[PDB]
Amino acid sequence: CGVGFIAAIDGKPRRSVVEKGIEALKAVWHRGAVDADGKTGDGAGIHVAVPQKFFKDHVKVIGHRAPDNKLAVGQVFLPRISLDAQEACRCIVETEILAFGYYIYGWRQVPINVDIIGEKANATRPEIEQIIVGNNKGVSDEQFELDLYIIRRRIEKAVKGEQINDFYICSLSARSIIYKGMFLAEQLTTFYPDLLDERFESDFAIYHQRYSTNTFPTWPLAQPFRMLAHNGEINTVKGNVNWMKAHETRMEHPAFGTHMQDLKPVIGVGLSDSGSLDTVFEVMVRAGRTAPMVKMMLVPQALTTTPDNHKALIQYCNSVMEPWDGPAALAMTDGRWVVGGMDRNGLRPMRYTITTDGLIIGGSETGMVKIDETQVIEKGRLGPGEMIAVDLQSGKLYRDRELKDHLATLKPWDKWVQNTTHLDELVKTASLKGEPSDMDKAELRRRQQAFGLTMEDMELILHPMVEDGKEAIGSMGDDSPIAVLSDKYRGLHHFFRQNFSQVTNPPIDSLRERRVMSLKTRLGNLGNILDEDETQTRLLQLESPVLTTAEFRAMRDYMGDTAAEIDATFPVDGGPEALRDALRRIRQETEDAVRGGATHVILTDEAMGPARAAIPAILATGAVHTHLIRSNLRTFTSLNVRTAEGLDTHYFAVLIGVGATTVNAYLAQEAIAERHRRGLFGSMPLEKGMANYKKAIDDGLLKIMSKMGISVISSYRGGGNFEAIGLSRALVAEHFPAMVSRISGIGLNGIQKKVLEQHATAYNEEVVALPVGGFYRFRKSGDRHGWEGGVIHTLQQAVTNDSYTTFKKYSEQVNKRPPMQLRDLLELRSTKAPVPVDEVESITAIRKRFITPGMSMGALSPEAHGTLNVAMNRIGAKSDSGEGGEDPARFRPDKNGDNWNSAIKQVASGRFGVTAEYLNQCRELEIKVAQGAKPGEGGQLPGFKVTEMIARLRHSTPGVMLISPPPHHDIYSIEDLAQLIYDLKQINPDAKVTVKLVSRSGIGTIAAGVAKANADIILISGNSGGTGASPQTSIKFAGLPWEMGLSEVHQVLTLNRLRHRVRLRTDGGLKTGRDIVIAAMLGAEEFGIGTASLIAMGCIMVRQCHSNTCPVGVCVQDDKLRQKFVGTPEKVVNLFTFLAEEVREILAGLGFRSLNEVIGRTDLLHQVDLDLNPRLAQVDPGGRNEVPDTLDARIVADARPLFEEGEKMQLAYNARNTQRAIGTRLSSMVTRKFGMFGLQPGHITIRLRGTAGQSLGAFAVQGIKLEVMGDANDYVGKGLSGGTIVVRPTTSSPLETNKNTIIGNTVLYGATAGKLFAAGQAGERFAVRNSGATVVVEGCGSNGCEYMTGGTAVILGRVGDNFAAGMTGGMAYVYDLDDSLPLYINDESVIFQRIEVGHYESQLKHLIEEHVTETQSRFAAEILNDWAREVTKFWQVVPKEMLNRLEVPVHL
């Protein structure tokens, strides 16, 4: 994959612009899935100017006369198999161009060579044909495209009405034309020779290859699109899409004249995300807005450093259009400008070079197209939010600032912005004036009972919010029933699961990166995206959809005649259809209101009473919002909800994203008060009370959002980002935005019945106390759980006394209950007579398919951890190190023969103990993208668990907390995954690689991509798995059952013929023989067993894993407490032995003599309402994935002496952007023979001219040194491990070392040792997570030194926003010539001072010296020359938590 762009700064056409454009496309294949087929690829494209010589001649050769104007071309994919349709297609195409009365010189079959296409693709190949049009009407450049645009839509529309498939017009303008198709980019020129003609000349270019979650090639989905080309993904798409359904309700502009209606819907069916973007971007530009304005209105930068002009503008946009978020490198152009742009988080690479010849070449990597250093005038990149551009009419280049300057210039942004009413202060005022409360406990209690609330609810969850202003953290998995199956009133919000993101895009850090996020809310800002007038700022604005009963009324008053209140409630005397008609009613009443003139709606349960049940706020909000959309009305109101049932963060999230503008949990502020008048909060005023509550819910949301990288509530709102488990298809469709509900579930009639039942509970008689509740924990009360006391005892009894009979009694205890989980709804019947048990496969055999999941050293006691490693190795199975290091002492068997080393090592966001030697002490690497306990997010390890041993392991700082970054920093998109897997397979030639993913609908597809990315195993984790520490909403609301995700992967992978390329594993609550058989039949080959293995080691399931108070030594770092541990290998081994025997017992009954004979065999399962079909369906009823060599292949060959004799060596080689992971293999080899540190620095040194591609020197141990004279791309020294890497411009380059980029992003991610020197600037997230590498570099993008925990980080230059966020431990100095660092640095955990002590001043000096020595850097050398005055300019950045720990104090 890639996007790229090229432009002649002067405006004047050239052939090289196209030849370069090809050139690029020939250097991206190293980033894609190569087929063994040699031909098949996902899509490539080049968007250049229609070449008027070439075309005109053509018209001449047929013997017409060339017009004076520009001649248009339509580039069109016709149906290729039904001639009947091609015609219909061409009549339509002609008719439409005809009624605008332009002129047709006529069709031209495009030459192409289908030999380089694969069959899959030739299959779906359309018939490519050009049609040539002339501007007989003598209109203007601008009018021609405008008209053509209305024409293309007209066609597009008619073909649709005709119901014609496969028709598609890539381009149809007289400025631009697109040559895209499904074939390898390196072969664009082969499939389309026109491109090789010298008449193809052009002032600009835009190329793009693409990847996919597929094996199927659609042609129209290859890019570039008509104005756009996108690398990334736009996670906020359904959000955007539904907004347009309303944005459109009002869009009207005069340029389309009477055409608008043909103009809608601007987004047709079947578009890819980017495709939909281009769609919108286009209309906007067709109506007048420049390119750069549009990038902004749609992919605005974050309004955190910023001039005030810009801020105005931004604020303007944000008020018109809600962003289109997701990682995004974009290459754009309206007719005149050409733009390179970034998403608001700089999520994708985008280097660029400027030449003496007056060209700019935009890129994704950098070595992408030869250019002589000699003619380089600059070497840049884009950072979050920036653009760079060219105005081809004036042949002027604008860098970000200067370009943004320009747009600020266009209008009185501020004066206009000043037109908004921020009703904030007005609202805060009334709160301080006193959050009221008007119910008597006798009431609170009874309503509360209506929505089935409890003490656990009040104590466990509400309280901490009020107190700490933070939400409840907890531990152990979610073992309760899944709500539909529940026995006990659960509220709608229970069935909506929060979606989150896995490999497609990364989730954000809402702590360390809160500045880019946002919760602004606006009532009445929905008018003409098409307009550009100040009247667009006239709207009210909150800063949280969240309102305390005080603030709420504040607002509701300011509104007034303008608001309308709808009674979300229904009679109980009602009848079987009570709630239905209720839902109609509300729907209608809101209609009338809005029509009637109303501008705000207030939906509410307030009139709930003994005679009226409340309509489930969630259902009521959706029913309303949707119908509102469905009648083009939502654009006229704000929709605000008052809910008695609301209480936690989740409930807000759902409400909001199913419509809600504003929410007020009124009966909870109440419940807060009552608590407060028994002084449960102590001194603290009820007002500060709410304040906190509110922050907890605000950060609440910001989080839930970040789980699918979304930075902003307006796109999130109404986007329906949930998945419904349990409610009926029909329903979910009827009333909420689009969401999946893969098995229908209950419907209104059930909902009604349950709502009312709980109701009687609370108005049928007195209520002094809520029940206790046993949702977050087993009480011997109502809610059941998997793990309950009896069950735990019996199991313990069983593995301790070693009786299989006791085991069997446990599992029976377990299997004889009411269904609690989906698998529980299946029977296993077969058609074979039974077989004798002896005959089946053996336990030895079976238990080997079992593994003990990754549970970190930290989360668990050292004793527990190694216990597990011993058990697994004893029975020839495998265990998983876990998110947190593994001690290397452990790399040998002990006198007793026991083996503490673990067979599968993880690799997760904060790369904990990740070392060349760690990565090499195993048979398998598990890329942890996610756990079912907390999908969207990333591990926690409370500070008081960060023992010293722990801290030593992890290179973290003692007793300081370890919260991990939710996304991996080197996996922002699937190609990214792809490359990690490559490095992984490079540093360790023997291991298989796994990808831990978490079930959720859509996993299937990703699953595929993972497969194309060379993963060997894929593991789908259930929603219910365990965690040592994790917020409770994720434990109860993120994730989906494995029975759904595991089949989906089984199916989809099968459906694309990849299902044999990868092995499948699953975990999530598997405690029993049958749980394991059923998982096999659904497709699994391996099963993971954690918690139950913990319980055998003794866990009693008391849930204080986060607390460091383990009654039993399982999950606790405390010494005394660790002495109460009685786990034993022998115990765990017994657990597995039983499990397998119980598996064999079952297979025999089924007539099978082995597990393999039953994988995938879903015909053996019958579901004994929900629709379990989609899970049972069969698609077609009736070593390791190896990888390509790299430079290392030769380097190694050339190093015989190294390994053979010990010699020292110096090698030289060129290097291209296309060579990845250079050295890594070397490193694996060296680490294996001499170990990370048995070689003295520089022992084997390899100079490289040119460009290093991703992962340069990744995992290099000491002894290796790489000099890259030239430059590099992302991830230099990723996981650096005591090796050394240096990078400087070519002796001959005339560039100013420090004013130019030289290495990409996420450099030194997670390193632990070694040095890195860089004559130049580095891009985003430099030194992220560095845990002990020393570096020197002349500058650095934003988010630098983030989450760093060790090492020294010098920095000869300016530094990006949010520097040092979460930087708990190492140190960075920072030459700052403008005393600006103050404006960029992220305070929170760090401080800066000028050097005072002189050993710190000396430390710096020596590095900088090294730097120079290695890099021959002038600018550096000069700082050395004026040390005196200069030292004065740096700034010591030192972590708070490091102040008292530091041998030599930093002060005095």
Ligand SMILES: Cc1cc2nc3c(=O)[nH]c(=O)nc-3n(C[C@H](O)[C@H](O)[C@H](O)COP(=O)(O)O)c2cc1C
């Ligand atoms: C205490 C504990 C620690 C865990 N630590 C990790 C971890 O370090 N890395 C990881 O990728 N998943 C981790 N997990 C999840 C397990 O690896 C596995 O996905 C899940 O535990 C199995 O769920 P089951 O508990 O119902 O047996 C942890 C889970 C628990 C309960």
Ligand SMILES: CS(=O)(=O)CC[C@H](N)C(=O)O
């Ligand atoms: C190379 S790419 O993976 O960024 C593809 C981009 C886009 N989401 C698409 O489906 O075309």
Ligand SMILES: O=C(O)CCC(=O)C(=O)O
């Ligand atoms: O130990 C850690 O860093 C993480 C452990 C974890 O996140 C979990 O077990 O839920």
Ligand code: F3S
């Ligand atoms: S608190 Fe974890 S619950 Fe198991 S580990 Fe101790 S009993």
